[PDB]
Amino acid sequence: MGRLVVVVTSEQLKEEVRKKFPQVEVRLVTTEEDAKQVIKEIQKKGVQKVVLVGVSEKLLQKIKQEANVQVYRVTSNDELEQVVKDVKGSGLEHHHHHH
C-alpha cells in the first residue's frame, strides 16, 4: 500500500504512460546515473511497487537488490496498464483487450 513509480528508459514511453495514467508518477532513465537517482527516489518516497519498463537486465537486478523493492518488469503497454490498476482499484481508464 503506497506509491507506484513507473520507470522508463525513453521519453516516448514516459509521455505515453503519463498521458494514459496521470494517477501514477514516472521516472526517466537516459543514463545509469538516472537509474541511481531512481534507487534513491524509491526509498525516500517509500515506494514498495516499482515498474521497470523496457530497462536493461543489469539495471533491472540492480534497482531490485539495492532498493529492496517489488519490481514489475514490463515489455508491453498492456503489462504496465494492469500494474497501474493493481494499485488503482477505482481505475479512471479502460485497458484495451487483445486476441
Side-chain angles (χ1 to χ4, degrees):
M1 185 63 180
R3 296 178 174 231
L4 186 62
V5 176
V6 181
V7 182
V8 297
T9 52
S10 302
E11 300 184 76
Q12 59 175 30
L13 298 179
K14 183 177 183 185
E15 64 184 275
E16 182 71 76
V17 178
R18 298 191 70 192
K19 189 68 63 177
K20 300 180 67 58
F21 312 100
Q23 52 187 28
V24 297
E25 58 194 83
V26 182
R27 294 294 71 182
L28 181 58
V29 175
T30 60
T31 61
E32 182 183 77
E33 300 194 79
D34 301 292
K36 298 178 179 190
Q37 293 179 89
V38 172
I39 300 174
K40 305 180 190 305
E41 189 80 308
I42 297 169
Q43 303 177 33
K44 298 307 186 67
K45 267 82 286 183
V47 189
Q48 290 67 215
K49 292 167 169 287
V50 180
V51 187
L52 293 181
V53 184
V55 302
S56 307
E57 179 184 28
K58 294 294 182 62
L59 300 181
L60 179 91
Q61 302 290 28
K62 188 167 183 167
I63 279 58
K64 171 54 187 166
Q65 298 175 92
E66 298 191 295
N68 184 214
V69 293
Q70 297 301 90
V71 166
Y72 299 80
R73 184 178 191 181
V74 167
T75 57
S76 181
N77 295 88
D78 291 82
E79 309 311 293
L80 179 274
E81 290 177 61
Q82 299 304 270
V83 181
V84 176
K85 302 184 68 58
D86 181 86
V87 180
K88 298 297 299 177
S90 303
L92 302 176
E93 37 56 55
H94 294 272
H95 167 254
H96 59 168
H97 50 249
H98 298 231
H99 51 282

